[PDB]
Design a protein around this ligand. Structure first.
Ligand SMILES: CC(C)=CCC/C(C)=C\CC/C(C)=C\[C@@H]1[C@@H](COP(=O)(O)OP(=O)(O)O)[C@]1(C)CC/C=C(\C)CCC=C(C)C
Ligand SMILES: [Mn+2]
Ligand SMILES: [Mn+2]
Ligand SMILES: [Mn+2]
Length: 334
């Protein structure tokens, strides 16, 4: 490997810890392509997340980010985010980007372009409806699934269908992102960011921050269960998507994060502790189970086990209880 590509893998291990291992195991050309895609996405997210950058300054950066990939000299030296190194040494990443086959470059730049436009749109608004929640998730995560899928198809390790079924790929991304947002209530509230959809939480409290108040814990947990229930609706699509993958390394790459997210939602379900910080995800059980789960029947058994865990904890009085049971029964029979 070149020194620049070695550096890129260094950055991948620092900035995308949960994905680094499955990425490095990808077959052939997919490995570098996905590594670089992850790094450019990390840089773009680091811009989006940085609240020290004014909206006025941020908007052109997000819009023009895709074009920076083709400017050998471009870097950004003003980030105060923890992953700023990928911005400050962007030339190393964009160099390796321009080393990828054109077919991968085209997908990556297209997704960066579309993601930047969408991220910019949300700088001036909160998330209101459930549809707006889906829209925000599409821009920051669904498009990643779509991009990854198009990379798989372009590589020819997977069929054209994988890249073409953008709804299924979108769902894979939405599932991870909704899980992240649900899980990260308190961290986000403390950093002054709000992602829970207003049309949902405003049925419980007047301000999203009110869920951090001990007196409101029961309403907070109802809302939590409602949002989890919404996220579970993506699982049929995740099963459909995973069922089509032919290449082992791709399957592992796609399946592992989805199972980790499922385990996270199960740990979050009906759990007051979400409102007090990080929940013990029983990450370990999931990681251990996935070692052996290299095929659809094994993946399905794990999903069913986590769904059964949620199901037997559904409170009778929970306003979402009927819906939660309904989606779990759908998942079980897919
Ligand atoms: C390319 C690769 C492996 C990883 C990319 C991750 C990187 C480095 C940057 C992207 C940052 C953005 C914009 C969104 C979220 C990633 C975590 O960011 P984070 O900072 O925690 O969230 P936030 O800022 O909202 O708090 C996220 C969860 C996207 C996950 C979607 C996937 C993986 C598609 C699955 C679909 C199939 C596989 C069909
Ligand atoms: Mn972000
Ligand atoms: Mn982020
Ligand atoms: Mn988050």
């Amino acid at each position: 490997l070149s020194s620049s590509l070695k550096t890129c893998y260094k950055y991948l291990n620092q900035t995308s810890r949960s994905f680094a291992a499955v990425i490095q195991a990808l077959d052939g050309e997919m490995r570098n392509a996905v590594c670089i895609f992850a790094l450019v996405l990390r840089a773009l997210d680091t811009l989006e997340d940085d609240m020290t950058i004014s909206v006025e300054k941020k908007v052109p950066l997000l819009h023009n980010f895709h074009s920076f990939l083709y400017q050998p000299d471009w870097r950004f030296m003003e980030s105060k985010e923890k992953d700023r190194q990928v911005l400050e040494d962007f030339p190393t990443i964009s160099l390796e980007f321009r080393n990828l086959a054109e077919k991968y470059q085209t997908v990556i730049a297209d997704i960066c372009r579309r993601m930047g436009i969408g991220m910019a749109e949300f700088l001036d608004k909160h998330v209101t409806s459930e549809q707006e929640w889906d829209k925000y998730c599409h821009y920051v995560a669904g498009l990643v699934g779509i991009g990854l899928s198009r990379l798989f198809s372009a590589s020819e390790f997977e069929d054209p269908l994988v890249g073409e079924d953008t709804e299924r790929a979108n769902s894979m991304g939405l599932f991870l992102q909704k899980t992240n947002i649900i899980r990260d209530y308190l961290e986000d509230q403390q950093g002054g960011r709000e992602f829970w959809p207003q049309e949902v939480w405003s049925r419980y409290v007047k301000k999203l921050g009110d869920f951090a108040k001990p007196e409101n814990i029961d309403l907070a947990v109802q809302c939590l269960n409602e949002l989890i229930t919404n996220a579970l609706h993506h699982i049929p699509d995740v099963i459909t998507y995973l069922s089509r993958l032919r290449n082992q390394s791709v399957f592992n790459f796609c399946a592992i994060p989805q199972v980790m997210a499922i385990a996270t939602l199960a740990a979050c379900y009906n759990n007051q502790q979400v409102f007090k910080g990080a929940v013990k995800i029983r990450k370990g059980q999931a990681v251990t189970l996935m070692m052996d789960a290299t095929n659809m029947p094994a993946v399905k058994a794990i999903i069913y086990q986590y769904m059964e865990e949620i199901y037997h904890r559904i409170p009778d009085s929970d306003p979402s209880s009927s819906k939660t049971r309904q989606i779990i029964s759908t998942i079980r029979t897919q």
